[PDB]
Amino acid sequence: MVACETLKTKKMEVQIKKNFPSVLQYTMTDGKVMYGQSKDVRTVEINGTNIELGDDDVTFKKVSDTEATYTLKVKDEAKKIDAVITVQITVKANQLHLNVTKIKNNLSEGIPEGNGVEENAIQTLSFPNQSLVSVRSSQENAQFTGARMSSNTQKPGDTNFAVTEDTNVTDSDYTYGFISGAGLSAGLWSNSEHDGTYVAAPVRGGSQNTRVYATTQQTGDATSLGLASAPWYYHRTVTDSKGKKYTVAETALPQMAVAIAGDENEDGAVNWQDGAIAYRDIMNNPYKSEEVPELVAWRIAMNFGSQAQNPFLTTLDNVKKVALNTDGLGQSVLLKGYGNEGHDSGHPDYGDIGQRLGGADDMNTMMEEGSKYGARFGVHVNASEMYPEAKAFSEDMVRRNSAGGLSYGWNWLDQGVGIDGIYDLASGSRVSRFADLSKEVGDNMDFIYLDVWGNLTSSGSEDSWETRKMSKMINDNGWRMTTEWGSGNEYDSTFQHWAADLTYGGYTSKGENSEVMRFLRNHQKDSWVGDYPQYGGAANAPLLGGYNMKDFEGWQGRNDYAAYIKNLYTHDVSTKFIQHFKVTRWVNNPLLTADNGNAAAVSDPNTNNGNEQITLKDSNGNVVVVSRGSNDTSSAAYRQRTITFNGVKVASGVVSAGDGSATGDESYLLPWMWDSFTGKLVKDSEQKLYHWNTKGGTTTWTLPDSWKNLSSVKVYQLTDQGKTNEQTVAVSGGKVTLTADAETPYVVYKGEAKQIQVNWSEGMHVVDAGFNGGSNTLTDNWTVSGSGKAEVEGDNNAMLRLTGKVDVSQRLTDLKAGQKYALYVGVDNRSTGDASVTVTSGGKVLATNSTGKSIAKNYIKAYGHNTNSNTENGSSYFQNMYVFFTAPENGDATVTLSHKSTDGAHTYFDDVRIVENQYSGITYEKDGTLKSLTNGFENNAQGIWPFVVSGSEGVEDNRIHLSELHAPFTRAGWDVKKMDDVLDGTWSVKVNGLTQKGTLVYQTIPQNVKFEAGAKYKVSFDYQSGSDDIYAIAVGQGEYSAGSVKLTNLKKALGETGKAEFELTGGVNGDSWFGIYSTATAPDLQGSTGNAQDFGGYKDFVLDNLKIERIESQTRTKAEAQDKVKEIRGKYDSKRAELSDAAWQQYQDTLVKARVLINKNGATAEDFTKAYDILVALDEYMKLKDLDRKLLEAARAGQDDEVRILMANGADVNAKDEYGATPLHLAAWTGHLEIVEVLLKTGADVNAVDSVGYTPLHLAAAEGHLEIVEVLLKTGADVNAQDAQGITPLHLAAWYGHLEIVEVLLKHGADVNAQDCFGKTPFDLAIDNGNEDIAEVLQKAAKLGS
Amino acid sequence: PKSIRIGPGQAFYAX
Ligand SMILES: [Mn+2]
Ligand SMILES: [Mn+2]
Ligand SMILES: [Mn+2]
Ligand SMILES: [Mn+2]
C-alpha cells in the first residue's frame, strides 16, 4: 500500500520512505518544514562501487512510532559485492538518527584469527546523495555554513554562503556542515573516519577528518543543497611496512544524525548558530571533556636521563604549592618522563613506571593525594619511536623502508627507531602495552598525552581511522585524550600542546581557527588560538581567550614559578571562567570576509556598535557576554574586551600581550562559583571572586546578585603560603572598592575563610623535604640548633641556607625496620668548612657524609637548581650528597643537615629524599676515611653516582645516562650497532656522541668519593670507547680548569669490553677527583654513512664495574720525606719568575702542607709516607706544567724537532698561554706549516679559541699563510668561525688585503654577507683599507647569491 | 678604531 510512514515525537513528525532509508520532510510542531531527499535516490556505495537498489532489494518494518528498520540487499557479482545491510531510523525530540545496526557479508566467513586478510571485505560504505536534510534556493534566507581544519591564524577554516540557483556542489566535504532556510536550521553529524579537504594543517593526525558531504540537485524550479555522511570504514584492509596485509574490524558501526532547530538563541535570524545549538545534543563529545573547564593550571613536570629531577612525591608538593597560590583551582600535570630513565627513554614500554622516581607506588600516592587538591595527572607516551632498551623492541615492531632497512629516528641518549604503526595496531601490541599501564595506575590517572602522532613517523598514513582506533584504546582505559600538534585529532582530543603553548611553531602551526568549531566545542577543548599578537588574525586578542601554557618543573629548562602563576591569572583564569558557559550567539567576527568565502557571515550593527560580540550561557541560565572595543586592528580598542556576568561588568581592559611583548591594563573580579572536582556549584560560605589588576590601583566593582545585601567582604592576597593579609572591605549599594598591587592575585569571600591545610612531603619520611613551608617550617617541622643561622631562602624554589655553626634536624617517619635505605640531599657549599648530612638512632651515628667547598657546577637543564638558576652569585653547585644506612629496629631515626664552620659563607640544601636502596659498596677504614668504593650502577637511586655531569654541553638535557640491557638489540652486532650498551649486569654509564668537545664530560666529587690528602688509591673500571683517543681519563684537584688535569687517552674497545686502571694520590686540600674527558681527537667513523655514524657507536663511551681501592705505599722515614722537600725545592724554587702568581701560590701551598706532615709533633711513618707521596705528585705536576710552557715557546719560535720531543715526553698539545692561545694558534700565527701539521696529526683542536675568540685560522688568514689556511680547512677548521666581535676569517683576510687567502676562504663555505657586531661585511672592511681589488672580487661573489 | 695588527688576545676593535 503507502510507500511512506510517519515517525513522531512531541517536537516533530518525520515522513520516511518504505523503499529506502530516506526522509521526505520534517514537520515541526509550529508547522515549519525542512526537506530530506525528495528525489528517487537509492544509491549504496560499497568499496567504491555504487549500487542502485530496486523495490525488491529493500524490506521495511515500522517498529514503533519512533523507530523503523530496513534491510538492504546490496549486490554486484562483477565487483565482488553481496551483502545485507540493516539500517535503523529513530526519532527523539527534534533529532533523527540513522544507524547501520548490522552488516552481513555473504562472500565471507569473517576476519581470520590474528587480523588476517578477509577476502571480499566490506571496507567502505556510504549512501551517495542521501540528502538527509536539505535547503532549496526557493526558500527564505537559504544558506550553507561549513568548517574545515585550519591551524593558520590568517586563514579561517569557515564558509558561509547563500544557496542560489547558481550553487553547484558535489560531495563537498566539511568537518561540520549546517544548512538553514524557511525558518529552520540543521547540521549533520556522522562518525565517519573519512579524511578530506582542509584549509591548513602541518600534520595528519585526524586533522583532515571531514564527515559531512554537501551535494546539490534539481527539485523543479529550485536548486536543493542536501547534506549526507562522508563514507564509513567497516572491515578495512591495511598493509604494514614489511608488506604484510591485515583486515581490521570497525572502531564503531556506521552512525549519523540531524537535529532540526528554529530560533534557538531567540535573536532575529535562523542561521547555523541555531543549528549549532541543537547539534550539541547529537554530536560526539570527547571522553572526559566535561572536566576541561576545571583544568586552570596545566604544566609539565619533567624527568630525564636517570637523574630523577622530579620524583612523584616532589610533584605532589608542587601541586600543594600551586593549589595554595590559586586557592584550590583545578590543575593538570603532564608527566614527561614518568617511565623508564625519563623523557625519550624506554619508549614504547608504557607500563614501565620510573623506578628512580618512586615507581608505581609513589605515582599512585601522588595521583590519589593530588586529586584531593583538584589536580589531574597524565603521562607522555610515544607510539611512533622506539629504543633498543625497551622490552617491546622487536623485529616485527621495527619500521622498515622500501629498501628493507631501518627507518631511523632521532639519536640523543640512544638511537630511536620508527615503530610500525599498522603492525602495532593490527597485532594488538599497542592495546597490550596500554593495558600494562592500566594495571599499574588503575582508575587514578586522568589523561594520556600522545606525542608526534600525525608527523608520519609510524606510517605514511596516520589517518583519522588509525587516530580513532588509537583514541579508543586510551579512552577504554578511562583516560582523556591529549596530543601534540594543534590541528591533530579533531574528534577525540581535549588538548593540543602546540595550541596551548603559543610559543611553538609560528602562526601557521597553531590551534583550530574556526568560528564553527569554537562555537560548538570551546568548553570541551584547549585546542584553540589564544592571544599571541605577533601571529595576527585569530591570535590578536580572541574574545574567548585561549589557554596559554607555562611551566616551572624542568620542561625545556623552564623553572620560573612566579612567571608560571602570573601567567595563569593573566590569561587562564578568564579563559577557564568562559569555558563554564556554552556559546549561543556570535556576531560581527572581524576575521570573516567576502574574500575568504564568508559573504553571508552573521552581521549585526545593533549589537556592540557593529563590533565583535559573543554571548555564552549555562544550564542554570547565566549569561556571559564578551564584547570587543572596535573591529579595526589599527585601533587601540581592538584589544579592549569587556566581560559581563548576568548583565554586570566582571572583566575589562586589554590583556598583557600573550607573546610577552607589551603589558596591558586588564582588571577583573570574576565570580568563581564551581568546585574544582565535578565543577558543581559550591554553597554560599564557599562562594568566591578572583581579583586581578594588571597595572595595580583602586577599582570599583558591582558584586553579583547573590552578594548585593552583604555589609562587608573579606579579601586575601594569594601567595606560595596561601591566603595572607586579610582585609575587611565594606559593601555600599552592592558595590566594592578594591586596592590591588600590580599583577597580584586576591580572593574575595563573603566571610572569614579557613586556610587550605597542607601537610608538606606526604610519604617522604620527613615533613617539608623541599622547604616550601615558609620561615615557620624551621619552627614547626625542622628543629634548628646552634650559634649560627638557618633561613628558608629563595624567592622561586625555596632552599635551606645555613650560615655559621648550625644543625637542622628532623625525625624520620614510616621506615621499614631492618630495611636498607639511601638518603640524598642537594647541596651547594660556598664555605670552606664542611657541610654534612647525618642519620642517627638515639645519639649513635648510623651514617654520615660531608662536603667542603662545592667544586662542580650543576648542568642538568630539567633540575630546579642548575647553574642558570643563580643559587648564589650567578651559579649553582648543587649536587646530591648520599648516606646509606639500615633502618633501626627501635624505630628512632633522625636526619641532621649541618654546617660546622664559624665562617660567614653560605651552604644551600634542598630536597631531602629518603628512598629504599640496596646499594652496599662503600667500605670505610678504622677512622671514617674511605677504604673501598665499588659500583656496577645496579642500585643507583638517581644519576651517574659517584660521578656528576660536567659542562661539555653546558646547561643541557645531557647525553649521559644509565644505559639498560635488552639483548640482542642493545648488544654489539644488531643491525649497524658495534658497541654494547651494558658491559656487566643490566646497567652501565653511557656517553652518546660527546666527541671533540675538548673538555670534561663527567667527574667524581669529594662529597661522593673523598681522596685523603697524601693517600694512594687504585682506580679501575670496565669500559667501551668507539675510537682511539676520543675519550680520556682526567685526574684533577678542586674546580675544573683546563691544563690542571692529568689526561690519559683511552684506546678503542668497540664490541669487546676493555679494562682501564690507574693510581691516584690525594691532593693536600682533599679536593682530588677523577673523570672522563672528551678530547679534541676526531672519531674513526670507519666508512659509516648517515645514521650508522651515530648508531655504530664510533663516538660513544660506556663505563661499568668501578672499583676505587685505598692502597699501601712504600714506607718512608722523616729523612726520606725531608730529603724529597730539598729535591723539589732545589728544582722549582729557581722558577718564581717563570711561573704565574697562582701557579707559584699552589706550589707553596703544597710544600707547606707536606712540611706540616713531616714536622708535626708525634708524626709516624704514615705521615712521612703521605708527605713523600704528595711531593712526588707535586713534582710530576710541576714537570708537566713546564713541558706545556716550553711547547708554547717552541711553536712560537719554530723548533720542529723540539716540538716533537716535548710532545713525545707528554707536553699537552692543547696547552693555553695567558691569552688562551694554543701551540697550534702560535704556529699558524707565526707561519710554520711543519709544526701545524704534526700538531694536527697529534690531536690539537683546529677550532680552539683564544680569549678574544680567534681560532688558529683567524690568525692564519689575518697574517696570510695560505698553505696553513688550506691544511686547517682540510683538517676540519670552521671557515665561518666568529670572533667575540663577530669577525670571521674572511673579514681579517679582506681588511689586511690577502687576495689569494680571500679566494680560498670563499672557495670553501665562507659567507660573504657575514657581518661583524658593527654591521660591517668583509667587503665594507676592504673599502676602508683601500683594497678595491679585494672589494671587487668580494662584490662579484656576493652578486652570484641569486 | 681598527687595530694596527692582531694576534693572541688582541681584539680587532680596540678604539
Ligand atoms: Mn537565531
Ligand atoms: Mn624546594
Ligand atoms: Mn653494571
Ligand atoms: Mn637509554
XYZ file of C-alpha atoms in Angstrom, chain A residues 476-1026:
551
model
C 38.768 2.465 27.002
C 41.232 2.517 29.886
C 39.373 5.513 31.372
C 41.848 8.116 30.034
C 41.178 11.552 28.496
C 42.917 12.166 25.113
C 45.505 14.966 24.649
C 48.015 15.208 21.663
C 50.987 17.306 20.361
C 50.008 19.231 17.172
C 47.371 21.945 17.009
C 45.269 20.517 14.154
C 45.609 16.882 15.446
C 42.648 14.658 16.492
C 39.616 16.809 15.749
C 37.301 14.011 17.042
C 38.652 12.866 20.454
C 41.417 15.275 21.661
C 40.714 17.699 24.568
C 44.207 19.442 24.385
C 46.986 20.107 21.813
C 50.339 21.186 23.180
C 51.056 23.272 20.050
C 47.674 25.122 20.537
C 48.054 25.584 24.400
C 51.760 26.525 24.342
C 51.513 29.509 21.941
C 55.397 29.882 21.765
C 55.716 26.873 19.436
C 55.645 26.583 15.698
C 54.674 30.013 14.446
C 51.411 31.455 13.003
C 50.733 28.500 10.584
C 51.017 25.694 13.167
C 48.641 26.706 15.992
C 45.172 25.658 17.248
C 41.826 25.214 15.467
C 40.943 28.504 13.731
C 37.130 28.238 13.184
C 34.119 30.243 14.437
C 32.027 26.991 13.905
C 34.355 24.565 15.793
C 34.997 27.025 18.734
C 31.255 27.979 18.918
C 30.410 24.261 19.228
C 33.307 22.973 21.401
C 35.121 25.858 23.213
C 34.107 24.346 26.641
C 35.449 20.804 25.777
C 38.927 21.524 24.351
C 42.140 23.612 24.936
C 42.743 23.250 21.166
C 42.180 26.884 20.099
C 44.060 30.088 19.229
C 44.817 32.313 22.239
C 46.378 35.773 22.486
C 49.841 35.910 20.777
C 49.629 39.177 18.719
C 52.747 38.541 16.528
C 50.748 35.830 14.648
C 47.947 38.304 13.896
C 44.434 37.245 12.938
C 42.909 34.774 15.404
C 45.891 35.390 17.787
C 45.111 39.108 18.166
C 43.074 39.225 21.361
C 40.479 36.422 20.668
C 37.369 37.282 22.770
C 37.145 33.750 24.299
C 40.803 33.877 25.370
C 42.796 30.685 24.876
C 44.979 28.507 27.020
C 48.479 29.976 27.499
C 50.795 27.292 28.938
C 53.892 27.942 31.026
C 55.907 25.506 33.142
C 58.203 25.601 36.131
C 59.270 22.000 36.575
C 62.178 21.470 34.148
C 60.382 21.297 30.779
C 62.836 22.999 28.291
C 64.801 24.479 31.219
C 61.583 26.316 32.357
C 61.654 26.957 36.110
C 60.182 30.484 36.878
C 57.425 29.735 39.375
C 56.388 33.461 39.688
C 56.099 33.730 35.856
C 54.026 30.485 35.803
C 51.467 31.850 38.334
C 51.320 35.446 36.930
C 50.511 33.876 33.521
C 47.644 31.733 34.966
C 45.942 34.880 36.253
C 46.803 36.921 33.166
C 45.247 34.524 30.606
C 43.968 31.200 32.033
C 41.554 32.126 34.875
C 39.431 34.228 32.340
C 39.794 31.509 29.581
C 38.555 28.819 32.021
C 35.806 31.002 33.516
C 34.440 31.394 29.897
C 34.615 27.537 29.353
C 31.952 27.185 32.103
C 29.400 28.593 29.540
C 28.370 27.400 26.035
C 28.306 29.814 23.000
C 24.740 30.748 21.905
C 25.336 33.799 19.680
C 28.495 35.065 17.979
C 28.107 38.128 15.677
C 30.412 40.668 13.867
C 33.547 38.494 13.542
C 36.306 40.742 12.024
C 38.112 37.696 10.541
C 35.223 36.620 8.302
C 35.052 38.455 4.946
C 33.555 38.006 1.457
C 37.077 37.435 0.071
C 37.768 34.423 2.357
C 34.452 32.726 1.456
C 32.268 34.139 4.262
C 29.929 36.550 2.354
C 26.814 35.504 4.361
C 28.516 35.721 7.768
C 26.393 36.919 10.751
C 26.476 40.842 10.878
C 24.501 42.901 13.453
C 25.035 46.687 13.592
C 22.592 46.812 16.542
C 24.938 44.597 18.624
C 28.067 46.232 20.132
C 28.136 49.225 17.695
C 28.643 46.623 14.897
C 31.822 45.220 16.617
C 32.506 41.531 17.644
C 30.350 40.053 20.374
C 29.969 36.542 21.830
C 27.023 35.517 24.124
C 27.579 32.330 26.202
C 25.020 30.661 28.565
C 24.951 27.757 31.089
C 22.374 25.059 32.195
C 21.234 27.352 35.165
C 20.560 30.241 32.736
C 23.541 32.523 33.474
C 24.696 34.869 30.705
C 28.310 35.899 29.925
C 28.684 38.486 27.117
C 32.206 39.126 25.809
C 32.399 42.273 23.603
C 35.304 43.809 21.538
C 36.074 47.555 21.699
C 36.479 48.216 17.925
C 36.692 45.848 14.965
C 39.560 47.978 13.432
C 43.009 46.297 14.031
C 44.699 49.757 13.841
C 42.536 50.935 16.797
C 43.672 50.769 20.428
C 40.148 49.420 21.140
C 40.557 46.193 19.090
C 42.326 44.707 22.131
C 39.745 46.135 24.662
C 37.422 43.432 25.956
C 34.559 43.745 28.467
C 33.005 40.584 30.062
C 29.584 40.751 31.792
C 28.173 38.092 34.118
C 24.345 38.384 34.214
C 24.470 41.954 32.927
C 27.157 43.100 35.470
C 30.756 44.012 34.303
C 33.277 41.405 35.715
C 36.342 41.988 33.461
C 37.510 44.975 31.462
C 40.546 46.163 29.505
C 43.446 44.999 27.322
C 45.329 41.809 28.442
C 49.137 41.760 28.551
C 50.163 40.522 25.045
C 50.426 36.710 25.170
C 53.861 36.923 23.443
C 55.117 38.902 26.449
C 55.716 41.945 24.230
C 53.594 44.604 25.963
C 51.750 44.613 29.336
C 48.084 45.664 29.384
C 45.576 47.261 31.735
C 43.021 44.446 32.234
C 41.415 44.292 35.638
C 38.724 41.720 36.626
C 36.608 40.474 39.612
C 35.481 37.081 38.296
C 32.861 35.058 40.197
C 34.375 31.518 40.687
C 31.251 29.574 41.672
C 32.302 25.949 40.984
C 34.204 23.203 42.825
C 37.468 22.003 41.277
C 36.167 18.400 41.058
C 32.858 17.758 39.219
C 32.548 21.535 38.707
C 29.301 21.594 40.697
C 28.119 24.858 42.239
C 29.550 25.435 45.759
C 27.476 26.672 48.809
C 27.295 30.411 49.862
C 30.070 30.217 52.542
C 32.311 28.562 49.782
C 31.477 31.197 47.048
C 34.408 33.428 45.972
C 35.659 36.083 43.459
C 39.168 36.416 41.944
C 40.561 39.950 41.712
C 43.433 40.971 39.397
C 44.624 44.454 38.231
C 47.497 44.391 35.650
C 48.657 47.989 36.329
C 47.710 47.987 40.027
C 45.495 50.631 41.614
C 41.989 51.125 43.021
C 38.921 49.955 41.084
C 35.175 49.872 41.965
C 33.025 46.828 41.148
C 29.320 45.704 41.325
C 29.164 42.371 43.276
C 26.952 39.524 41.885
C 23.215 39.470 42.831
C 23.969 36.747 45.476
C 26.276 39.239 47.392
C 24.212 42.533 46.952
C 22.938 42.561 50.609
C 26.342 41.896 52.374
C 27.686 44.786 54.532
C 31.329 43.669 54.082
C 33.587 41.190 52.162
C 36.857 39.512 53.213
C 39.800 39.946 50.805
C 43.033 37.809 50.884
C 46.243 38.140 48.953
C 47.307 34.783 47.445
C 50.951 33.591 47.866
C 53.043 30.345 47.813
C 51.775 30.143 51.500
C 48.032 30.680 50.650
C 45.574 33.346 51.917
C 47.575 36.184 53.560
C 46.949 39.884 54.505
C 43.204 39.522 55.251
C 41.366 42.862 54.660
C 37.731 43.675 55.568
C 36.319 45.706 52.691
C 32.866 47.391 53.067
C 29.991 46.943 50.556
C 27.878 50.072 49.650
C 24.878 49.676 47.330
C 26.036 46.223 46.176
C 29.448 47.703 45.200
C 33.084 47.149 46.471
C 36.297 49.190 46.117
C 39.498 47.111 45.955
C 43.118 48.378 46.117
C 45.378 45.889 44.247
C 49.160 45.621 43.740
C 50.173 45.266 40.076
C 49.818 41.722 38.744
C 48.980 40.301 42.233
C 46.170 37.780 42.892
C 43.453 38.403 45.555
C 40.472 36.200 46.537
C 37.188 37.684 47.862
C 34.915 35.749 50.244
C 31.532 36.638 51.880
C 33.097 35.951 55.289
C 36.159 34.581 57.124
C 37.984 31.908 55.059
C 39.516 28.806 56.567
C 43.109 28.164 55.382
C 43.520 25.089 52.951
C 45.556 22.676 55.128
C 48.777 21.406 53.532
C 50.884 18.625 55.035
C 54.161 19.019 53.245
C 56.094 15.977 51.976
C 53.489 13.211 52.463
C 55.063 9.738 52.234
C 58.524 11.355 52.015
C 59.652 10.110 55.535
C 60.209 13.749 56.590
C 57.900 16.877 56.708
C 58.833 19.624 54.207
C 61.622 17.929 52.185
C 61.561 20.849 49.660
C 61.439 23.701 52.262
C 58.114 25.063 50.840
C 56.569 25.712 54.282
C 57.853 29.245 54.850
C 60.101 30.660 57.599
C 57.953 28.692 60.137
C 58.966 25.290 58.630
C 62.135 25.760 60.742
C 59.973 26.142 63.877
C 57.184 23.594 63.244
C 58.797 20.758 61.208
C 62.639 21.065 61.368
C 64.386 21.943 64.654
C 67.288 24.382 64.476
C 70.179 24.240 66.996
C 73.490 26.123 67.160
C 75.102 29.578 67.404
C 74.694 30.293 63.662
C 71.602 30.951 61.466
C 69.166 28.778 59.397
C 66.943 30.593 56.868
C 64.432 29.387 54.233
C 65.917 31.484 51.340
C 64.819 31.511 47.680
C 62.048 33.519 46.029
C 61.407 30.838 43.324
C 62.305 27.321 44.606
C 62.845 27.771 48.400
C 66.020 26.293 49.985
C 67.670 25.906 53.367
C 70.515 28.411 53.798
C 72.979 27.749 56.604
C 75.409 30.466 57.910
C 77.971 29.713 60.652
C 77.713 26.838 63.214
C 74.140 25.423 62.912
C 72.331 21.957 62.807
C 68.864 21.484 61.151
C 67.342 18.153 62.278
C 64.082 16.222 61.948
C 62.746 12.799 62.966
C 62.371 10.196 60.124
C 58.908 8.531 59.851
C 57.478 5.301 58.356
C 60.802 3.470 57.728
C 60.677 -0.371 57.487
C 62.943 -1.713 60.328
C 65.927 -3.773 59.179
C 65.436 -2.473 55.597
C 68.206 -0.767 53.579
C 67.755 2.969 52.731
C 69.640 5.724 50.827
C 69.185 9.329 51.930
C 70.378 12.004 49.498
C 70.133 15.849 49.647
C 71.011 18.606 47.173
C 73.956 20.610 48.454
C 75.683 23.865 47.278
C 78.507 24.679 49.757
C 80.240 28.064 49.383
C 82.015 27.773 52.773
C 85.475 26.179 53.183
C 84.139 24.406 56.304
C 82.345 21.062 55.923
C 78.576 20.764 55.120
C 77.193 17.459 56.486
C 74.197 15.087 56.295
C 73.860 12.634 59.204
C 71.433 9.848 60.130
C 71.296 8.919 63.865
C 69.437 6.342 66.031
C 69.215 7.723 69.616
C 72.540 9.622 69.689
C 74.501 6.817 67.898
C 75.634 7.758 64.313
C 74.183 5.259 61.779
C 75.641 7.052 58.696
C 77.317 10.401 57.895
C 78.799 12.245 54.857
C 80.206 15.762 54.239
C 81.385 18.210 51.505
C 83.951 21.022 51.804
C 83.581 23.877 49.284
C 81.500 22.686 46.270
C 83.708 22.144 43.189
C 81.227 21.209 40.360
C 78.531 23.480 38.860
C 75.091 21.957 38.052
C 74.438 21.323 34.327
C 71.047 19.497 34.490
C 68.592 21.626 32.401
C 65.470 19.872 33.858
C 66.696 20.333 37.551
C 65.395 23.225 39.724
C 68.872 24.328 40.907
C 71.151 24.233 37.823
C 73.953 26.914 37.227
C 71.397 29.082 35.257
C 69.252 29.320 38.435
C 71.610 31.689 40.435
C 71.604 29.876 43.872
C 74.205 32.466 44.861
C 76.310 34.841 42.777
C 75.183 33.679 39.291
C 75.915 29.983 39.671
C 74.744 26.750 41.310
C 76.986 23.950 42.551
C 74.000 21.855 43.706
C 74.894 18.132 43.650
C 73.423 15.322 45.767
C 75.150 14.027 48.959
C 74.317 10.432 49.969
C 74.173 8.461 53.180
C 73.448 4.739 53.095
C 72.022 3.186 56.297
C 69.758 0.328 57.583
C 66.567 1.488 59.335
C 66.883 0.791 63.084
C 64.938 -1.980 64.839
C 63.949 0.564 67.593
C 62.249 2.956 65.092
C 64.233 6.056 66.261
C 65.866 7.510 63.091
C 66.853 11.200 62.693
C 68.347 13.370 59.858
C 70.619 16.409 60.609
C 71.863 18.903 57.976
C 74.848 20.711 59.448
C 77.488 23.393 58.871
C 80.471 23.177 61.272
C 82.407 26.398 60.377
C 82.026 29.803 62.139
C 82.675 31.138 58.527
C 80.104 33.715 57.283
C 79.773 31.848 53.940
C 76.501 30.134 52.989
C 75.586 26.430 52.498
C 72.449 25.554 50.474
C 70.368 22.392 50.987
C 67.211 21.242 49.239
C 65.079 18.107 48.518
C 65.832 15.596 51.317
C 64.980 12.221 49.748
C 64.818 9.027 51.863
C 64.399 6.111 49.483
C 64.684 2.272 49.726
C 68.087 1.325 48.221
C 70.003 -1.931 48.158
C 73.404 -0.266 47.364
C 76.209 -1.518 49.705
C 79.566 -0.753 48.009
C 81.326 1.642 50.408
C 83.815 0.238 52.922
C 85.419 2.555 55.463
C 88.739 2.492 57.397
C 89.003 2.407 61.276
C 88.915 6.269 61.051
C 85.840 7.305 58.998
C 88.024 7.552 55.777
C 87.366 5.665 52.526
C 88.913 2.177 52.310
C 86.998 0.939 49.153
C 84.136 2.096 46.771
C 82.660 -0.281 44.133
C 79.738 0.355 41.788
C 78.224 -1.671 38.947
C 75.450 1.008 38.628
C 72.841 -1.691 39.506
C 71.368 0.242 42.536
C 71.703 3.944 41.647
C 68.922 5.846 43.393
C 69.428 8.632 40.848
C 72.057 9.954 38.370
C 75.512 8.599 37.434
C 76.760 8.457 41.109
C 79.675 8.551 42.317
C 80.058 10.715 39.148
C 78.273 14.012 38.363
C 77.619 15.515 34.901
C 80.137 18.223 33.836
C 79.625 21.070 31.349
C 80.775 19.663 27.959
C 77.283 20.690 26.661
C 76.625 23.434 29.279
C 73.143 23.571 30.846
C 71.505 20.895 28.688
C 69.360 17.663 28.571
C 72.793 15.871 28.824
C 73.646 12.929 26.546
C 74.940 10.980 29.611
C 72.588 8.449 31.341
C 72.396 4.918 32.866
C 72.062 2.526 29.864
C 69.775 -0.553 30.167
C 70.233 -4.095 28.795
C 67.856 -5.579 26.171
C 69.772 -8.290 24.277
C 70.162 -8.682 21.282
C 69.143 -5.080 20.340
C 71.408 -3.304 22.903
C 74.388 -5.629 22.261
C 77.050 -5.178 19.515
C 76.204 -6.696 16.116
C 72.420 -5.999 15.938
C 71.836 -4.038 12.675
C 74.709 -1.477 12.356
C 75.421 -1.378 16.144
C 79.156 -2.000 17.013
C 79.177 -1.186 20.783
C 77.394 -2.892 23.746
C 75.128 -0.534 25.764
C 75.766 -2.537 29.020
C 79.122 -4.138 29.965
C 78.142 -6.086 33.180
C 74.675 -6.683 34.718
C 71.671 -4.710 33.453
C 73.103 -1.140 33.815
C 76.142 0.960 32.740
C 77.072 4.699 32.313
C 76.609 5.610 28.597
C 78.015 8.789 26.886
C 76.438 9.420 23.438
C 78.386 11.323 20.729
C 80.176 13.776 23.042
C 83.331 13.794 20.825
C 85.754 16.688 20.018
C 84.480 18.834 22.987
C 87.992 19.455 24.413
C 86.610 19.397 27.956
C 85.357 17.298 30.931
C 82.234 15.051 30.319
C 81.722 13.770 33.929
C 83.733 13.662 37.222
C 83.555 12.339 40.822
C 83.189 14.968 43.565
C 84.628 14.817 47.174
C 81.058 14.510 48.706
C 80.777 11.252 46.680
C 84.370 9.834 46.664
C 86.803 11.535 49.101
C 90.542 11.146 48.444
C 92.566 11.757 51.586
C 95.490 14.188 51.369
C 98.600 12.110 50.579
C 96.826 8.720 50.294
C 97.296 6.304 47.305
C 94.237 4.850 45.521
C 93.954 2.247 42.748
C 91.101 3.159 40.372
C 89.791 0.582 37.849
C 86.758 0.287 35.539
C 85.434 -1.706 32.555
C 84.864 0.474 29.502
C 83.935 0.567 25.791
C 85.049 3.555 23.568
C 84.218 3.752 19.828
